[PDB]
Amino acid sequence: LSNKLTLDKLDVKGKRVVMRVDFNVPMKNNQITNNQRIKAAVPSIKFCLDNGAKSVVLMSHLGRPDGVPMPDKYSLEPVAVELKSLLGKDVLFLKDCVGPEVEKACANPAAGSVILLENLRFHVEEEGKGKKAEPAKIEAFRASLSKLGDVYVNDAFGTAHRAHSSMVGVNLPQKAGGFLMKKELNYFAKALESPERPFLAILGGAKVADKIQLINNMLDKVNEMIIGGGMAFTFLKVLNNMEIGTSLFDEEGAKIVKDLMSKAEKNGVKITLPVDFVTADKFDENAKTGQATVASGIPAGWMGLDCGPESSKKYAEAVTRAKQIVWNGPVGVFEWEAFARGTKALMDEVVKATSRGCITIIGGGDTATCCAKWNTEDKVSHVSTGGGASLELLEGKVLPGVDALSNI
Ligand SMILES: Nc1ncnc2c1ncn2[C@@H]1O[C@H](COP(=O)(O)OP(=O)(O)O)[C@@H](O)[C@H]1O
Ligand SMILES: [Mg+2]
């Protein structure tokens, strides 16, 4: 951010501040399971209020409602409640994020007002697609958001890889990076400058279509890569002709698997894929469970939701060799006890590695929740609010949310 406006240089006195945050927090049984991402924005929010901001209007997405209002499933209302406790101030929640009624709520607020808008992705104009997109409405959506403040702050590190309307399209004269954006970028700048080697990337989780497309460039930066979680099945189906049942599979990514493996070979990147699994008869906490290996395949109508013990051993071996690790994506559905062992075991190993001097970086809305669940947040080097955003920094890219900020 050396050439970007940041919040420490933004005059907020008497100003309405419209602020993009990443409040895309994990939810289970409808409750917030980790408030990490909300707590992480509090320093910027408090700074604005302590320095005389007239208001702070907070906007985020939650999940992927795909441009349709889904207040039953993906409302940010619970976040407003949580933010109250964390701030020490009350926060007014609006049931939309644009236009007439929201614009009036934000036009001239009482001094010190904190306002949280509803899920930006209830409108197809945020992402620009759903559910297909339309330029004049996209422009109009961005215009509306811009009226909600006099100055703009982006503290949404976790979303900074998304060139979405709220992230790159707000038109106000001063667009400043917040303190979380600064903290995260500064950490990664230093950690990625001259990594300790071997440098291992651990890629798991879900969102396989997105994550598989990051591997090509990551292969130029790391010395080893664990490909686990939901992403492994695309690789195993292609490379081993493994039956994968109903496990996550990315048709598009499947087409580049062999090219990625070629490139890993060319670059001397050792790829560790799982070799065994805990299977489920459906995507449910209380599914019937089984075991499978790559040789056995996964039966029809069953899905692999965790790696098995033989995979955990191979993952542990990669971790023991590492002097630096970036981990994004649990290696199983760790939210459900039946499918949590692989991720706990990997967590144990990553903690052990830190203790003997490994630089260990865990990132993501869900992967950071692994740290919270097993009480390891202060037992690794850094826990980032960014998952994909962090992987994009590892690739060596500028994040669109940062690029869109005002130059100094
Ligand atoms: N084999 C699997 N099949 C389906 N989902 C999985 C599997 N392994 C992990 N997951 C899920 O991936 C989800 C989070 O992945 P992701 O969003 O990519 O991570 P992060 O939010 O840290 O970037 C977790 O909710 C976990 O339940
Ligand atoms: Mg996630």
Q: What is the DSSP string of 87-111?
A: HSS--EEPS-SSSHHHHHHHHSPPT
Residue 4 DSSP class: B
**Please, what's the b/e burial string for 235-270 (b: 16 or more CB within 10 A of its CB; e: otherwise)?**
bbbbeeebbbbbbbbbeebbebbeebbebbeeeebb
Q: What is the DSSP string of 198-261?
A: SEEEEE-SS-HHHHGGGHHHHTTT-SEEEE-GGGHHHHHHHHH---BTTS---HHHHTTHHHHH
Q: How far is the C-alpha of 305 from the C-alpha of 138, rounded, in Å?
A: 38
Look at strands 16-20 and 151-154 and give their pairing.
Answer: parallel
Q: How far is the CA of 253 from the centre of ligand 1 (A)?
A: 17
Mutate to test the pocket of ligand 1, among 237, 250, 302, 366 (most ligand atoms within 8 A of CB): 366
Taking the CA of residue 387 as reference, the ligand 1 atom at the shortest distance is 23
Ligand nearest to the CA of 369: 1
Q: What is the DSSP string of 140-158?
A: HHHHHHHTT-SEEEE--GG
Facing residues of 177 across strands?
A: 6, 154
CA distances from 152 to 20, 98, 121, 328 (A): 8, 16, 19, 29
Q: How far is the C-alpha of 322 from the C-alpha of 199, rounded, in Å?
A: 6
The answer to whether 61 is annotated as binding is yes
Q: How far is the C-alpha of 320 from the C-alpha of 242, rounded, in Å?
A: 28
Look at strands 31-32 and 27-28 and give their pairing.
Answer: antiparallel
Residue nearest to atom 16 of ligand 1 (CA): 205
Supply 395's token pair. 């690739």
H or E stretch covering 57: strand 55-59
Q: How far is the CA of 60 from the centre of ligand 2 (A)?
A: 15
What single-letter amino acid sits at 342? G
Residue nearest to atom 12 of ligand 1 (CA): 205
Q: Kindly list the catalytic residues.
A: 37, 207, 365, 388
Look at strands 303-307 and 276-280 and give their pairing.
Answer: antiparallel
CA distances from 67 to 74, 115, 130, 163, 238 (A): 11, 22, 5, 15, 33
The answer to whether 22 is annotated as binding is yes
Ligand nearest to the CA of 248: 1
Ligand nearest to the CA of 385: 1
Domains of the chain (ranges, CATH numbers): 2-180 (3.40.50.1260), 187-395 (3.40.50.1260)
CA distances from 75 to 38, 57, 61, 110, 355 (A): 15, 16, 9, 25, 40
Supply 119's token pair. 């899920």
Q: How far is the C-alpha of 67 from the C-alpha of 311, rounded, in Å?
A: 39
Experimental method: X-ray
Q: How far is the C-alpha of 343 from the C-alpha of 215, rounded, in Å?
A: 21
The answer to whether 37 is annotated as binding is yes
Residue ranges lining ligand 1, Cβ < 6 Å: 204-207, 229-230, 248, 304-305, 328-330, 332-333, 335, 364-367, 387-388
CA distances from 155 to 74, 169, 256 (A): 21, 15, 34
The answer to whether 366 is annotated as binding is yes
- The rounded Cα 333 to chain-centroid distance in angstroms is 16
Q: Which residue has the tokens 């490909």?
A: 227
Taking the CA of residue 207 as reference, the ligand 1 atom at the shortest distance is 18
Q: How far is the C-alpha of 288 from the C-alpha of 282, rounded, in Å?
A: 8
Residue nearest to atom 26 of ligand 1 (CA): 333
